[PDB]
Amino acid sequence: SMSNTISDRIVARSVIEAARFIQSWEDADPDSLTEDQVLAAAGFAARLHEGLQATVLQRLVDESNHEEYREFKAWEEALLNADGRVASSPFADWGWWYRIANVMLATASQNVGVTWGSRVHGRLMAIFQDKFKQRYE
Amino acid sequence: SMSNTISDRIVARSVIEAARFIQSWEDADPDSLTEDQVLAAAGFAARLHEGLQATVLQRLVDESNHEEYREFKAWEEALLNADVASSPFADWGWWYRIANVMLATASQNVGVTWGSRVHGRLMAIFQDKFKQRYE
Ligand SMILES: [Ca+2]
Ligand SMILES: [Ca+2]
Ligand SMILES: [Ca+2]
């Protein structure tokens, strides 16, 4: 398939934060971010986090849709590896926040055609470590 | 099933235009719009049009999904009726449905109370800005 419906649904309910992040980080130097670039990244990640947590906890999914249900379960697995039911490692590779950083990279790719890499992604993860350590126990 | 995947896909690729529209219109008086408010609405609608036309022509839908395909067919019919007896600005036509997407986007992001007054103002903008595509 050529779709990522869960990401589209969450980004589509996060457009103000998404636009603020993309526009703030346009020519950003991840090695020397401004306070406003940090805040725009944290604000978008927090909005994505809120929507994704709601989708997982409330089971906002069609379990009969083979693709959507599997992709939901990957988000659910990431949440369980953050909230202690399976593990308490929210910042592990390919875990909850790593996947949110990936959605933020996707947002830039699909809106303005820019492809960020490790320097941006690692800086996002460091911001999340600084700001969101208390979002899980 | 209850889903908005066709519009979500495009809105998630239109976040700059979508945010500009929402933030421009949060204090908007549809009876006395600023020029920037007009441009913000037209810019989001034109972006939605581009993505929706691509969706129809490329058939970007799971046609085995009963509801997603029903919605797709309604977009496809609206596009056919817009290209004479074409009525691109008719009730429940192409641009009317785009105005619906714009109100849905505002509601799902910031919780607006907008209704028929805003929708009718958008339709007047769209007829003024886009009519030459059908002449
Ligand atoms: Ca997918
Ligand atoms: Ca399928
Ligand atoms: Ca729907």
mmCIF file of all heavy atoms in Angstrom, chain A residues 1-6 67-68 71, ligand 1:
data_model
loop_
_atom_site.group_PDB
_atom_site.id
_atom_site.type_symbol
_atom_site.label_atom_id
_atom_site.label_comp_id
_atom_site.label_asym_id
_atom_site.label_seq_id
_atom_site.Cartn_x
_atom_site.Cartn_y
_atom_site.Cartn_z
ATOM 1 N N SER A 1 0.843 -1.185 0.000
ATOM 2 C CA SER A 1 0.000 0.000 0.000
ATOM 3 C C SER A 1 0.880 1.238 0.000
ATOM 4 O O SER A 1 2.056 1.161 0.342
ATOM 5 C CB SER A 1 -0.924 0.018 1.214
ATOM 6 O OG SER A 1 -0.398 0.861 2.210
ATOM 7 N N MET A 2 0.309 2.377 -0.371
ATOM 8 C CA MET A 2 1.044 3.632 -0.372
ATOM 9 C C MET A 2 0.520 4.591 0.697
ATOM 10 O O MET A 2 0.636 5.808 0.546
ATOM 11 C CB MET A 2 0.993 4.280 -1.759
ATOM 12 C CG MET A 2 -0.398 4.746 -2.220
ATOM 13 S SD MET A 2 -0.206 5.676 -3.776
ATOM 14 C CE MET A 2 1.548 6.115 -3.766
ATOM 15 N N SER A 3 -0.039 4.059 1.788
ATOM 16 C CA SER A 3 -0.695 4.887 2.793
ATOM 17 C C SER A 3 -0.101 4.699 4.184
ATOM 18 O O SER A 3 0.454 3.652 4.522
ATOM 19 C CB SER A 3 -2.199 4.595 2.878
ATOM 20 O OG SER A 3 -2.441 3.328 3.483
ATOM 21 N N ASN A 4 -0.252 5.748 4.991
ATOM 22 C CA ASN A 4 0.080 5.732 6.417
ATOM 23 C C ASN A 4 -1.073 6.468 7.104
ATOM 24 O O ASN A 4 -0.970 7.658 7.418
ATOM 25 C CB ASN A 4 1.432 6.387 6.677
ATOM 26 C CG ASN A 4 1.837 6.343 8.150
ATOM 27 O OD1 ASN A 4 1.043 5.991 9.024
ATOM 28 N ND2 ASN A 4 3.076 6.703 8.427
ATOM 29 N N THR A 5 -2.191 5.754 7.307
ATOM 30 C CA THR A 5 -3.423 6.436 7.690
ATOM 31 C C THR A 5 -3.382 6.931 9.132
ATOM 32 O O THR A 5 -3.975 7.975 9.435
ATOM 33 C CB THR A 5 -4.641 5.529 7.502
ATOM 34 O OG1 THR A 5 -4.515 4.380 8.345
ATOM 35 C CG2 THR A 5 -4.791 5.101 6.047
ATOM 36 N N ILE A 6 -2.696 6.217 10.033
ATOM 37 C CA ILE A 6 -2.672 6.661 11.430
ATOM 38 C C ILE A 6 -1.879 7.951 11.556
ATOM 39 O O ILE A 6 -2.318 8.900 12.214
ATOM 40 C CB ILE A 6 -2.108 5.556 12.340
ATOM 41 C CG1 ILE A 6 -3.009 4.326 12.282
ATOM 42 C CG2 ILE A 6 -1.985 6.069 13.782
ATOM 43 C CD1 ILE A 6 -2.469 3.147 13.068
ATOM 44 N N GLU A 67 -4.362 -3.907 7.494
ATOM 45 C CA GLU A 67 -3.242 -2.972 7.511
ATOM 46 C C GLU A 67 -3.334 -2.017 8.697
ATOM 47 O O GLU A 67 -2.365 -1.869 9.460
ATOM 48 C CB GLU A 67 -3.193 -2.192 6.199
ATOM 49 C CG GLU A 67 -2.145 -1.081 6.216
ATOM 50 C CD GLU A 67 -2.034 -0.359 4.892
ATOM 51 O OE1 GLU A 67 -2.844 -0.629 3.977
ATOM 52 O OE2 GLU A 67 -1.126 0.476 4.755
ATOM 53 N N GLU A 68 -4.493 -1.372 8.870
ATOM 54 C CA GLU A 68 -4.629 -0.395 9.946
ATOM 55 C C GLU A 68 -4.439 -1.050 11.305
ATOM 56 O O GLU A 68 -3.832 -0.458 12.207
ATOM 57 C CB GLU A 68 -5.993 0.303 9.878
ATOM 58 C CG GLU A 68 -6.066 1.498 10.816
ATOM 59 C CD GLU A 68 -7.445 2.134 10.950
ATOM 60 O OE1 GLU A 68 -8.353 1.518 11.519
ATOM 61 O OE2 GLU A 68 -7.609 3.291 10.505
ATOM 62 N N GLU A 71 -0.778 -1.753 12.015
ATOM 63 C CA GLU A 71 -0.044 -0.514 12.250
ATOM 64 C C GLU A 71 -0.447 0.122 13.577
ATOM 65 O O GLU A 71 0.400 0.693 14.276
ATOM 66 C CB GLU A 71 -0.258 0.412 11.049
ATOM 67 C CG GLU A 71 0.465 -0.213 9.838
ATOM 68 C CD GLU A 71 0.288 0.485 8.500
ATOM 69 O OE1 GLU A 71 -0.401 1.525 8.379
ATOM 70 O OE2 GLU A 71 0.861 -0.050 7.524
HETATM 71 CA CA CA C 1 0.312 1.815 6.037
#
